[PDB]
Ligand binder design. Structure first.
Ligand SMILES: [Hg+2]
Ligand SMILES: [Hg+2]
Ligand SMILES: [Hg+2]
Ligand SMILES: [Hg+2]
Ligand SMILES: [Hg+2]
Ligand SMILES: [Hg+2]
Lengths: 330, 330, 330
C-alpha cells in the first residue's frame, strides 16, 4: 500500500536516488537482476525483488503493493558489443515496466530519462524542455535509445494516462563512482596525469546527489506529463580538465583538439565507406550535429520544484576525493 | 473503389512518382507517419493517411477502397545510427504492407526496389534483371535490406498470388533534391570546388523524372511478377565529376583514387579486428565485391514499356539549376 | 524411431560429423537449407530433409522418427554485414529447434557450442568447462552469440528437461574448408607468402575430424546437462605460422605485433568516438578482455569420453593439401 519501488538501484544514479528516498523515509523495494551486484546496496534496509524488464511476468510480483515507482536505467552508457539489440531491449523494457505499473495500479511513476533525449540549439544558448527535437537529428545509439524510450513514455502518458513525471539529468559526477562512468574515467585519467589529449566540447555537469534530490522533488512537486532537466553547470571540457588538474595538483592536458579538426576524418570516413560500398558510421552531416554544445538550462526545475544544484567544482572535488581514498589513482 | 495509394510520397522518388500520377489523373492517398514534413506534399490534392508499416493493425484503414498501390521507399540511402534496426523495419514493413494489400483486395501493386537488389557482372558488361545474385555476394546493410525486401515481394508473388510488378531504379538525380540525397551532395561538393578527391567507381544515373515515369509506365504496360530496371546512363564516377564541373564552370577534381589502393586498408582493417577480437566491417572479400561496376541495362523496360530515359547530362543539369534557384549553391 | 538427424552437414563442422557417423553406421538424415550449396552432402549415404531453423514448421516433418539429434551451426564465423540480426537468428533458430525436438520425442541431443561460449583465464592456464563467465565479460558478437545460444540450451536442459549434451570445440582446422573459415583464410594467406604481420595471441587448434570423433564419443558416453571441450593443442599464433610456413615450404612472417601495442589504438578509438558522439567499437576495457589467451583444456573429454585428439600439425597438413588440390593456393 505504501511501497516505493526503485529500479536500477545498483547504478551510480539509482543508488544515490535510493539513499535520498530512504532519508526521506519511504519503504523501499529494489528491483535487481538475476546477475547483479549488491555492493552499494546492503547499506539500505530494503525489500529486494528479483526480475528482468524484458519479461513482464516477473514484474507483477515486484509491483504488488507498490504506490510509487522510480524507473532509473540500470547503467549509464555501458559499452556493449550489440548496441542495436540493447536499444531494443531497453526501449521494450521500459514499455513493459510502464505497462506493468499501470496494470498493478501504481499511483505515481517517476521516469529517469536524460538530456540525451532532448533537443539542441545551434547558437550555443542553453537548450531546454521546449527545444524541438527530431529523430533525424540524433547521432548515436546511446542518444537514440534515450530518445526512443522517452518517446514511449510520452505516448503512454497521452494514450493510456500513465501517471508519469519525467526527469532529464545532465551528466552526473560525484562520489561513489564505482565502475567509473565514462566521465568519471576521464576525471580519473586526468587526475592521474595519463590523459595527454582530448577533443574539445561542451557539456553540463551535475552533482549525482543533486540528481538524486531532484528525483525526490519531482515526486513531491512535479506535474504528471512534464519533463524537468536536472542539470548543474554548462562547462567546456577544457575548463573541466583545468579544474580537475588544479584540484588534483597536476599539469592540465597538453593537447587540445578543436572539433572542427575532425572534418577531414569525416571526409575520409565518407570516402572509405563509399569505396568499400558500406555505410559510413561518421559523415560531415554527423560532425555538424555533434559539434553543437550540450548546454542545458535547469530553470524549469528551479522555479517549479525548488531544485538547487551545487556548482560543478563541488562534484568534481568529491569525485576525486573519493577516487583517492578508494585507491583508484593506482 | 478507385483510390491510388502511394507510400514514401515525401521522399525524393516518392513525390516525383506522386506528381506523375497526378498529371495522369489518379486519385491520391498518401501513407504518411506522424511527424512527416508536409512541405514536399502540399502541391498534391491528396487524402493523407497516418499509418506505420511495422504494425499490421494500422494499415487496413489506409487501404480501404484502394485499387492501386505504389510502395516507394520512405527514404533513399539515408544514413542512420541503427542500420540493422532500419533493415528490420524495411523488410518487415514491406511484408506487412504486402499482406494487408492482399487482405484488402488491391488489384495492382507497383513495388519500388532498386538495382541494389540485383546481381552484378565482372566483365563490365551492364547487368540486367536476369543476372544471378545470392545473399552472400551482397556486402552492405543498405544493399542487403533491399535484396531481402525484394525477396519477400517475390515470395508473395509466387506463394500468395501477390499482384505486384517490381521496378528497380538505379541512382536518381534531378531537381527538388531537398535533403539532398548523397549523390546530390556529391553534385554540390563538386559544383562548388570542395571535393578534392574521390574513389573511382562506376554507376548508373537516372533522371528522377524518368524513374517516376517508369513507375507509371510499369502500371500501364508491365506484367505481374516481372522486375524492370529503370536506369539512364552507365557512367564512371570521374566522368560524372568531369561533367558536373564543366556544367558548373569549375575545375574537375584531380585526385582520383583507384579502388585497388584500398587493399592495404582492407588488410589493416582485418588485422585490427582480429587483434581486438571483433568482427571487421570491411575485408579483402568485401573489397572484391565493391570493385564491380554498378552498370545496368534498361533494355527490358525500353522494349516492354516504352521507357525512354534521358542522358545523365539532363539530370545533372536540372539538379544544378534547382540548387541555384533555392540557395544550396551559386 | 531409427534416424540420426544432423543440421549444418553442409558446414565445415557438419561435413565432419556425418562422415564420422557413417563410419559408425548410423542411418542419417541431413537438414539442409533451400539455397546452401550441397557440395559436402555429395555422395554421403543419407536422407535429405530440406528445412530452415527460422520457422518451426519446416522442422516437425524433418524431426519425425528421429531418435538422435546433432545440432551443428552451419556457418562457422561467417562474416556478414548484419551481425546482430544474425545473432538473433542463431539464438532463436536454436530455441525453435530445441522446442521441436521435445515434441518429436528425440531421446538424445548433441549440441554443438564452442569454447567462445566459455570463460577465460587471465593467467594463461588453459580454461575448462568450469571457468566462470558473465555476459559483461564478452567481447564480440560471434562470442556473444555463442554465449547466448548456450545459455538458452542450458535453460531448456534445466527447466524443460532437454535431453542435450553440450560439446564445445575450439578452432577447427582441416579439409573441406570451403569458405574458408577465418582461420583457413589465415592458413591460405600464410601458406602463400601473403602475411607480413600478425598480432600475437594464443589459440587452441583442433583437427576438424577430432571434433567429429568428439561428437560421436559424446553421444556414446556423455551425461545429459554436461559440457565437453573438444580441443586439440594450445598454441601461440606465431608458432602456428612457423608451422604453416615450414609445411608450405615458405618464409615465416617476421612482423609480430605485441598485444600491448594496441593500447594507443584503443585510446585513439575512444577519442575519435567521443568527438563524433558515437559509441566506440573498441576501448581500453575491450582490449583488456581480448588480451587473454584463448587456451582450453580437454582433460574432461579425455577422462569421461576417451577423447584423444591429434597434434595441430596434422590439421594444418590436412588443410593445406585440401587447399592445394582445389586450386586455391598461389
Ligand atoms: Hg537516467
Ligand atoms: Hg590532466
Ligand atoms: Hg527505391
Ligand atoms: Hg570538383
Ligand atoms: Hg560449433
Ligand atoms: Hg607467412
Amino acid at each position: 500500500n505504501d511501497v516505493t519501488l526503485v529500479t536500477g538501484a545498483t547504478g551510480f544514479v539509482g543508488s544515490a536516488v535510493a539513499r535520498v528516498l530512504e532519508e526521506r523515509g519511504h519503504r523501499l523495494r529494489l528491483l535487481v537482476r538475476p546477475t547483479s551486484d549488491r555492493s552499494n546496496i546492503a547499506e539500505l534496509n530494503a525489500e529486494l525483488a528479483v526480475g528482468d524488464l524484458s519479461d513482464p511476468d516477473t514484474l507483477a510480483p515486484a509491483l504488488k503493493g507498490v504506490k510509487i515507482l522510480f524507473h532509473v536505467a540500470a547503467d549509464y552508457r555501458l559499452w556493449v558489443p550489440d548496441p542495436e539489440t540493447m536499444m531494443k531491449a531497453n526501449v521494450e523494457g521500459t514499455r513493459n515496466l510502464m505497462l506493468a505499473a499501470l496494470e498493478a495500479g501504481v499511483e505515481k511513476i517517476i521516469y529517469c530519462s536524460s538530456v540525451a533525449a532532448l533537443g539542441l540549439r545551434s547558437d550555443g544558448v542553453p537548450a531546454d524542455e521546449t527545444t524541438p527535437v527530431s529523430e533525424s537529428q540524433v547521432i548515436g545509439i546511446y542518444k537514440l535509445s534515450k530518445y526512443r524510450a522517452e518517446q514511449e513514455v510520452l505516448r503512454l502518458i497521452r494514450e493510456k494516462n500513465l501517471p508519469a513525471i519525467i526527469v532529464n539529468p545532465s551528466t552526473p559526477v560525484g562520489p561513489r563512482d564505482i565502475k567509473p562512468t565514462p566521465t568519471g574515467q576521464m576525471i580519473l585519467d586526468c587526475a592521474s596525469g595519463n590523459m595527454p589529449a582530448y577533443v574539445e566540447t561542451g557539456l553540463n555537469i551535475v552533482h549525482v546527489d543533486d540528481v538524486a534530490e531532484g528525483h525526490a522533488l519531482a515526486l513531491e512537486r512535479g506535474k504528471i506529463g512534464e519533463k524537468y532537466i536536472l542539470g548543474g553547470e554548462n562547462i567546456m571540457l577544457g575548463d573541466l580538465f583545468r579544474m580537475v588538474s588544479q584540484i588534483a595538483g597536476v599539469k592540465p592536458p597538453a593537447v587540445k583538439l578543436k572539433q572542427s579538426w575532425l572534418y577531414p576524418v569525416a571526409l575520409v570516413s565518407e570516402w572509405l565507406a563509399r569505396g568499400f560500398g558500406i555505410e559510413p558510421r561518421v559523415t560531415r552531416e554527423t560532425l555538424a550535429m555533434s559539434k553543437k554544445l550540450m548546454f542545458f538550462s535547469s530553470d524549469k526545475a528551479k522555479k517549479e520544484l525548488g531544485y538547487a544544484p551545487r556548482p560543478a567544482r563541488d562534484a568534481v572535488t568529491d569525485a576525486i576525493a573519493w577516487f583517492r581514498q578508494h585507491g583508484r589513482m593506482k
